Design a protein around this ligand. Structure first.
Ligand SMILES: N=C(N)NCCC[C@@H](NS(=O)(=O)Cc1ccccc1)C(=O)NCC(=O)NCc1ccc(C(=N)N)cc1
Ligand SMILES: [Ca+2]
Length: 223
């Protein structure tokens, strides 16, 4: 997250860290046994880390649980990032508490202008590199699709939306991948892509979760 702020320990209790020997992606806890992340975060041997603030210190509220199954969206396309969503089932159910909590799926899509919260442990600089140890947060509005589309030479599909700032300075970044965009208590977005970070005319592109609720519910019911 570039241009955000320190969230505060466990103030984003659905935020998870995906770890394969080191943090590599974010994700969102949607019930005690399931996490939503990005398909581009797919990796063999994922451990889900719940209740994290400082990802380099055991602070006392963590649950580490190995994935039993990863399910990348059937139609994920790695060249366009269309359908950039993945479900991860935990080997055992997380113990839900005030610091480890699930976030609701949306029932309707969110409208441009709505305020959302984006969070993660990704790069905090638009140029250069600094990876934070504690969770960072950014309040950011959903943008018009048209402006979203003008901002890129790459395809923006109906499964994507833009959120953030065209004037730069505030954005998600590498390492935030797979993490939540939560708007009015609903998981509306997943950190997907963007050209650099926090650059002028290159806001963030997010997977449009409201399009996937039937898939998420059916998959969870059958697995
Ligand atoms: N097919 C498309 N759409 N290609 C455009 C996006 C590719 C890539 N963008 S990028 O970070 O590497 C920027 C870039 C690098 C070299 C040359 C030009 C631009 C990218 O975003 N790849 C996936 C990735 O890196 N995701 C992590 C991520 C998370 C958040 C942001 C953000 N700014 N909000 C960006 C990237
Ligand atoms: Ca920790």
């Amino acid at each position: 997250i570039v241009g955000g702020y320190t969230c505060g320990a466990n103030t984003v209790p659905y935020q998870v860290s995906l770890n394969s020997g080191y943090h590599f992606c974010g994700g969102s806890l949607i019930n005690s046994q399931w996490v939503v992340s990005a398909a581009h975060c797919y990796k063999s041997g994922i451990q889900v880390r719940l209740g994290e603030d400082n990802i380099n210190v055991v602070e006392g509220n963590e649950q580490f649980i190995s994935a039993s199954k990863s399910i990348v969206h059937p139609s994920y396309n790695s060249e366009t990032y269309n359908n950039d969503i993945m479900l991860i089932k935990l080997k055992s159910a997380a113990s839900l508490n005030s610091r480890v909590a699930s976030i609701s799926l949306p029932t309707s899509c969110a409208s441009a202008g709505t305020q959302c919260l984006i969070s993660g442990w990704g790069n905090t600089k638009s140029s250069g590199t600094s990876y934070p140890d504690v969770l960072k947060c950014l309040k950011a509005p959903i943008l018009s699709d048209s402006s979203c589309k003008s901002a890129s030479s790459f395809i923006i599909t109906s499964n994507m939306f833009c959120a953030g700032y065209l004037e730069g300075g505030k954005d998600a970044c590498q390492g935030d991948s797979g993490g939540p965009v939560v708007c009015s208590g609903k998981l509306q977005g997943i950190v997907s892509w963007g050209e650099g970070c926090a650059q002028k005319n290159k806001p963030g592109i997010y997977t449009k979760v409201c399009n996937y609720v039937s898939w998420i519910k059916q998959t969870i019911a059958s697995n």
